[PDB]
Amino acid sequence: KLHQCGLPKAMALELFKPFVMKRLVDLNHAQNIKSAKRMVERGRTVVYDVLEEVIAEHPVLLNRAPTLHRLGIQAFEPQLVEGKAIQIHPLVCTAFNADFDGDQMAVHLPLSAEAQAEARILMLSSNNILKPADGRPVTMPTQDMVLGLFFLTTDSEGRSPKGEGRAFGSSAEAIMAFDAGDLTLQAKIDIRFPVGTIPPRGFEPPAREEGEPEWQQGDTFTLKTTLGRALFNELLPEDYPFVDYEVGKKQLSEIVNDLAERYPKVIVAATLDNLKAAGFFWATRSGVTVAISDIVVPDAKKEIVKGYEGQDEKVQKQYERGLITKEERTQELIAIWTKATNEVAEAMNDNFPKTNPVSMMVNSGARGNMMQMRQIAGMRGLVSNAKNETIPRPIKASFREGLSVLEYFISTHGARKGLADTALRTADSGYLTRRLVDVSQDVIIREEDCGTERGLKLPIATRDADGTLRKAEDVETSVYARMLAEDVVIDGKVIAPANVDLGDVLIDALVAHGVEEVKTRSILTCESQVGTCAMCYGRSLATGKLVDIGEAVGIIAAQSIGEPGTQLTMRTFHTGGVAGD
Amino acid sequence: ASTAPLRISFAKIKEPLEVPNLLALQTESFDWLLGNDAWKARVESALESGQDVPTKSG
Amino acid sequence: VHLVGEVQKVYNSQGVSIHDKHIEIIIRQMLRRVTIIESGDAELLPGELVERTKFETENRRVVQEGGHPASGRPQLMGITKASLATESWLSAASFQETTRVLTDAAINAKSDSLIGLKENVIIGKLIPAGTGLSRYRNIRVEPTEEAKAAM
Amino acid sequence: EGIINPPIDELLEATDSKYSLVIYAAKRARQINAYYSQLGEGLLEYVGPLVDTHVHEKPLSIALREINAGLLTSEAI
Amino acid sequence: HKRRLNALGPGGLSRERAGFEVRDVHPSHYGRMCPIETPEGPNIGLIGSLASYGRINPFGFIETPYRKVVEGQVTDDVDYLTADEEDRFVIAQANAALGDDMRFAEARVLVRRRGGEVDYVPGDDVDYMDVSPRQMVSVATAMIPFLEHDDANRALMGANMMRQAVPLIKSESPLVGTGMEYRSAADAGDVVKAEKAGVVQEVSADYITTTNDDGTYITYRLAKFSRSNQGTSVNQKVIVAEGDRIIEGQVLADGPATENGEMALGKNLLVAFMPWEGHNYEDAIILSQRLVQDDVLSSIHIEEHEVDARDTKLGPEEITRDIPNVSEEVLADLDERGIIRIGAEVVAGDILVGKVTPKGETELTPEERLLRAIFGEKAREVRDTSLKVPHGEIGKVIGVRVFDREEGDELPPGVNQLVRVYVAQKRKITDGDKLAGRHGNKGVISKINPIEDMPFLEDGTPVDIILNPLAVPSRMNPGQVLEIHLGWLASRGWDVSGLAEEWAQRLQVIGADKVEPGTNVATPVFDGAREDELAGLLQHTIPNRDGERMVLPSGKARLFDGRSGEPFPEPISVGYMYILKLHHLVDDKLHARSTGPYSMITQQPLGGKAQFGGQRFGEMEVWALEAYGAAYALQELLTIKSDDVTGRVKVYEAIVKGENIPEPGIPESFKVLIKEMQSLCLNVEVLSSDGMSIE
Amino acid sequence: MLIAQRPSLTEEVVDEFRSRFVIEPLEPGFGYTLGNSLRRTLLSSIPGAAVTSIRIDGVLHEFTTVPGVKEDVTDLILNIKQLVVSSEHDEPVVMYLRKQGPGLVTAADIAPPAGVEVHNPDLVLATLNGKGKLEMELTVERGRGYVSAVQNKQVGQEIGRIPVDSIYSPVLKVTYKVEATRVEQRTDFDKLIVDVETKQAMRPRDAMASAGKTLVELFGLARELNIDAEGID
Amino acid sequence: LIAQRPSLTEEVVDEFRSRFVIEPLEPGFGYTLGNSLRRTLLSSIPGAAVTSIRIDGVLHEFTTVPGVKEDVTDLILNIKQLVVSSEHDEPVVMYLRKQGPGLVTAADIAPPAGVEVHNPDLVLATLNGKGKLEMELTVERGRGYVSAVQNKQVGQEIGRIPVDSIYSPVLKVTYKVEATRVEQRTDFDKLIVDVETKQAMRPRDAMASAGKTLVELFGLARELNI
Ligand SMILES: [Mg+2]
Ligand SMILES: [Zn+2]
């Protein structure tokens, strides 16, 4: 479960030596303390039984070496387990950035009553759903489970939709039909729902037809959906409104955030666990694989490229007579091949079906990226020459066909440079994080309420097309999770009361009313005799509630700044022959 | 002939040159340093074959 | 605004997002000090860094005394200079540069008050952030009378 | 029968914060542990677990159980 | 290790002096320094392996071989070119095709020239071409099959990993691999090859005797279970029969990780690509209990720890069975002079050799005095200091060596006797063990299901290992999929005769047409089997049973879920993949600590596994803990759990007695610092608000 | 050689129709065998009776509307297949339902023939506006497991008659999960927890008793090959 | 509606491989039955295996016996796949002795009364003219797989050495399904399971034991109810 971690027998027994000794002497398994020491060193079975009795209800902080942000150290319930490696919950792995290629993670023991109380309340692995960087879920990774859910909530054409165009009395009979094999998981059908099933949020205005008042918001209602969507929704809690759209990765994050906002923590953890189980099961059934026939090179590629080659060699011919300078030939050839690789990328994009495994696991957001499939199937394209140049002859073969010898060499030219750049950037990112944390200390929240009313002007909605109002594209990182200094009246009536953190409903209402800017309170204008007040800083982001007095905002800010330093890894593609520009 | 166990080859192009003694880098260097019989033997072999080589030992 | 927007677009170029309050705290830290100019009545040196709160305090003292206030212009400097020029010499000494900061701490005979975080991690005392605050740690506990009456 | 067995939300709304909850439950856990280790002096000040107790238990689980039941109260000096 | 070219060293480019330019590949590194393989650590690129055909100029430059071309006719003559002479001429590519005659088949031919340019030059204009397409790749990278399809990064990781596979109990050569493993095994010094062409006369496990026709008799002694530098066995098998003829350089005895003179760094397993209940999430691996059951992945490990009977100022040390203040049964398996017998299983705490201190000034404490008076036991000046197996260990002793001062053997000054004991165990593959293939796909074992839970094939064969498909698209190493399909092809023979197909014609002319089941197959590193060949052979596999082929033309197969029992909804890709057991074994990584040794200059716990070292709570850990607002946990983790001598004994006593944890004091490192800055003439004084403070 | 701890089926009831059944520690990896075989047999092998066709007065198969009723035909089909019938005739049997006037027509108002019992008279089948006019006849037939709707040519025989999907299984669903338990210091024991949801007609425990008896017969069919002993209890 | 009870028919395809057909199964029933049968046929079957051995002049498996080209560990690997049938519920001792030059095989091992080696054509080692092999083997009976670690019970006998042993004598099972000829919408499926096992026992009694285990489990489930 979400708050459990496995400790091998030896490590648990060695960590808890004082406690195992105390428990052994108290139960008279051992005569005296020294004999208890001898018996634990011997490692008799009764010692392991006492250990299983003593670890429970005692938090242990699992902690990885980089510990980039405060989710690095997380408390867990320990649990004896055979073998010699820590067992961990795959949901929390992405919080650590902890892959399973090969990775060691330290275990620390809270000793005092205060320490274990803190690990119970504060550092618990289930009370840290939201990453403090921007206030979004980080504890729903996507490598495998999300593929399962995506395959589960998918429209037709994923297979031959047999058993399509029928209605089933309830999800149970639909499942029975599914085992019978007549129905397939991906097929549109009309499904009933027992009372209490809250319907789709867009289903509310529609209802059944009758001459009497009806309340379909909380009674029976048929619905044209898929059995998969029924399974997905019955993973989510009953009170959660039905979801009738494909989940993928973005919408899964959306619904997880909604759950984290409107529900208690325990329900959030249980829902995540159900989602995990169903995701693994249906990813197993998803049948995603890879084979030689899986990656089909587009047929058109060869033809188009030879056409380009003809043009290219023609250019080469008219360069042999001196009619064009070498620099001009290089530039026009680079442009030609950029055009060629864009065209072949589009052709490959059109060619590959939606049912193939790579499409399923790249569209869903499980793992991968469209240019990676581009250079697995289509030709790689232009590759950077050493010290940031562009070769004249790009690679015309994809990894399925197998690169040539010089092509492989000139690809290594960029690969090794990428490795070295990655290493230098992680070093510099660590240094930057240290500097930010060291300047940013001392800034603790030491006052409930500011003394002042001054605020900061922020643009609520920009790029308003003619005859309409359009909200800012990046409104979330700017104005969300901030407290209004003062109220707003636009029609003479108060719309957004003072000192309320902003969410989707209020932002939509204010945009609809047509206001163009807002006066949001923020730490910059904060006038606090001692540090900074809680309301100026607004709501925390890892908790979704007002920032408690005394929280360490400086350390969280510095860590959030520094965490994606390793992730940036962006550099100018080419100097262009000019320095200082 | 019977140097290695049979292994079906999917190669398409014949290779004129065979891979050299893969450990030549260390053994020949120390042979040269010692200047023992082996280094001078290779020196005279190169000289009669016309190949250049340092004829003074280390 | 310029710093917030610039750093935010630099981060967004890759695709990562961070909330602007994280940036704003650091930015307020960088702008904290002010360069004093025309240090006639204030009697201290001209053209050196001074904390904003100290500037406001001394200005209030001098205007109350009747002397005209000494001018000041806000000054922005890097995080490193801001960190080094801090009141707690122990925290700065725990930073990258030790010899110079320790040397001027000794020559100035400045006592490091233990308010803040890093220096209270040096000493081993309780950090004044979270469970270490006075108001959270002074509470006393006892059940109700009805709990004892029941048992 | 778990770390998350007493849900946190009731505790937060009871104590109005989160850090105050940690320190207050910690003080109670210390008191119950001191009582359990009396071993015979029987000081009148010490008070045992108000809620039922298992044969072997951690003091903090009982402290948080008491907080959830709400019979326990705090007061800042 | 032999062929590496360490740029780091005295009078040269040090780690600090490294820049961007030196690490980056150069167009000159072609046949002179492998660009694929290098350590991935901070010293990335500084250290590289010599190319396969590299040779050293006497002045110290590196040469490479190139064929000679004249009037468009490549000749069978070779010249060795250094890094400068290569610039003047224009060098072609070995991959360029050639006609039936020795001339070029195509006027257009890829070429490279000065400055690393790759422009083409059609017709008879070149003079030199690469002699073999594997010139640019070192031995390690040359081993990978289907290298050309892998990304450079994954091939780099696969070259780095292939140098960590431990030898197993029984080694098997790759079913699919480069054709070069034979040379790599043979020229390596591990293997034992004959120096005369004769007839073997006596074959045995320990030694093998041969008789050249001249008359000389030579017996080679095979090392057996002798510890290598990495604590791994070097067991050498024997291949030759009694009366079989021998030729010069022929192979007689395999080495560690070898088979019939062919390199064998691991076993080949049946792999199927499918997510499986999340136990292979994030690239972890699921493998059958068949491997645990049949010792397919099991490796011997021999540890050697020794103790010396030195003479101190009090007196000499004795290696005796009469160790003091011990029970009787602990010294059960010891020998006469206090040495563990050979073949006696040991465990943590077992006594290997019994050593006792000469003496020491013993001032018996009052409690000890009373207790000794009660029990009538005499606490003697001789004190126990015997060698014991470090914590967390197991093994059967295989050998013991004793060296004595008074004997003719020589020893360093002081040490009267020295004793070394070998403890050897057979580590099987278990959970947490790090496994990896050739193409940089690595993972820790996460679960070993029974043989039945494995999704089995149409003929009942369970798949020996499950791997997450999600790895291969992003990792951009589809070479492993190619390898899996070709491994399946190698396992089940194929017959191609008179098919009149293009790939069929290529196979027939190559000679790889009629292949029986099981025989190995070779795909050179840059002349591998085209995907057309794989497709055609998949069409024309030998029927393994009943006349049906279990793998469809697509290269996938019907997988029956072992647990549920129903067939999986769609076919699944399966085949034979070569995996290796890395040396990143879990047993060596595991380490815990209640309380143990403490450092001296600062009283904090010391580091490392060999000395019961507590993990380091770095700066970023305390930053994260502050971010949580957790202050008391920080106080305990800085003062109680280290760096305070008074508090550690108190907390241990309170925990054992059940009393509540006591209030922390001040840390010792702070007093070290205040004393140190007191010795720089800075009167660092700790003061209170009301005058002097209490400490 | 003998099993360390013998299993023992136990029950946990949260509703009269919903139930959970727990198997104690079991031999290693046996949890999936028993769990999935139990699921499939409990879902399919148990016999039962459910409607097989419906006939409305004065409608055509293509004419999906029914005069005099506010509700449509497809929801009526869903409702009728929801209803549970216990029949034993072993052949097709017919049931009638004739109701007029406005109001609500329910399973209670259905008149069953001899030997066929309707178990849940509470279900509301349809609502009438104005004159009800409703006349209806539905065919019931005992059978096993689950079968999808097919055309029998009843529509050709009588235009009003149409096929309908059936639920012959007395149980609605089985969800079985296998977890780990620790016994005599060993974690190699698997606990099976089977959640059985069944209709109001038949109690879940009797249904699984029937399923277990059927599996006992079906696997003891393998005793005929030879007589052999295996460790038990 | 139609009632038809399962019926089993057997056929032999080899001296140790058989195919068993059960026609009247329900739809979607053959796969699960075949899978459960396979799971129990591989997991729990009574068999005999070598649990420990002894060699003269050898104190551990790592060393080598003079005169034989394969190290003792190779002998562990060779005997580990030896297949035996033991009727004694207690451990039994067998003796393997071989002098002179020649191939020591599973044929020449001494069988005690009631314990039989079933693969005499296996080759265990080869001895030289000077060589000499003496060996004691302990055969026990059980089910499943047991590693050497839990089989060690004698400590003072340093000469004794345990070996990981495998008891299950079945090699593999493969089940498939079809559609019956009976005209109905159910389309009852015909489960056909093919079992091939080692030379220890005929597949008939192997599946008899599997059926006994499963029928006992399901009877335990049944009787405890009602
Ligand atoms: Mg990692
Ligand atoms: Zn404020």
UniProtKB/Swiss-Prot annotation, chain A:
Keywords in alphabetical order: DNA-directed RNA polymerase, Magnesium, Metal-binding, Nucleotidyltransferase, Transcription, Transferase, Zinc
Ubl conjugation among keywords: no
Keyword Transferase among record annotations: yes
Signal peptide: none
GO molecular function: DNA binding; DNA-directed RNA polymerase activity; magnesium ion binding; zinc ion binding
GO process terms (BP): DNA-templated transcription
Gene Ontology CC terms, in alphabetical order: DNA-directed RNA polymerase complex
Highest taxon of source: Bacteria
Binding site for Mg(2+): D99, D101, D103
Sequence positions that bind Zn(2+) 2: C450, C526, C533, C536
Reported function: DNA-dependent RNA polymerase catalyzes the transcription of DNA into RNA using the four ribonucleoside triphosphates as substrates.
Family per similarity comment: Belongs to the RNA polymerase beta' chain family.
Quaternary data: The RNAP catalytic core consists of 2 alpha, 1 beta, 1 beta' and 1 omega subunit. When a sigma factor is associated with the core the holoenzyme is formed, which can initiate transcription.
Protein name: DNA-directed RNA polymerase subunit beta'
UniProtKB/Swiss-Prot annotation, chain B:
Family: Belongs to the RNA polymerase beta chain family.
Underlying gene: rpoB
Protein purpose: DNA-dependent RNA polymerase catalyzes the transcription of DNA into RNA using the four ribonucleoside triphosphates as substrates.
Organism: Streptomyces coelicolor (strain ATCC BAA-471 / A3(2) / M145)
Name of this chain's protein: DNA-directed RNA polymerase subunit beta
Quaternary context: The RNAP catalytic core consists of 2 alpha, 1 beta, 1 beta' and 1 omega subunit. When a sigma factor is associated with the core the holoenzyme is formed, which can initiate transcription. The RNAP complex including the principal sigma factor HrdB also interacts with RNA-binding protein RbpA.
Curated annotation (Swiss-Prot), chain C:
Role noted for this protein: DNA-dependent RNA polymerase catalyzes the transcription of DNA into RNA using the four ribonucleoside triphosphates as substrates.
Family the UniProt entry places it in: Belongs to the RNA polymerase beta' chain family.
Subunit: The RNAP catalytic core consists of 2 alpha, 1 beta, 1 beta' and 1 omega subunit. When a sigma factor is associated with the core the holoenzyme is formed, which can initiate transcription.
The protein's name in its UniProt record: DNA-directed RNA polymerase subunit beta'
Taxonomic placement: Bacteria, Bacillati, Actinomycetota, Actinomycetes, Kitasatosporales
Swiss-Prot record, chain D:
Domain of life: Bacteria
Reaction catalyzed: RNA(n) + a ribonucleoside 5'-triphosphate = RNA(n+1) + diphosphate
InterPro entries in the cross-refs: DNA-dir_RNA_pol_omega, Pol_omega/Rpo6/RPB6, RPB6/omega-like_sf
Known partners and oligomeric status: The RNAP catalytic core consists of 2 alpha, 1 beta, 1 beta' and 1 omega subunit. When a sigma factor is associated with the core the holoenzyme is formed, which can initiate transcription.
Family: Belongs to the RNA polymerase subunit omega family.
PANTHER family named in the record: DNA-DIRECTED RNA POLYMERASE SUBUNIT OMEGA
Record-given protein name: DNA-directed RNA polymerase subunit omega
Biological source species: Streptomyces coelicolor (strain ATCC BAA-471 / A3(2) / M145)
Gene responsible for this protein: rpoZ
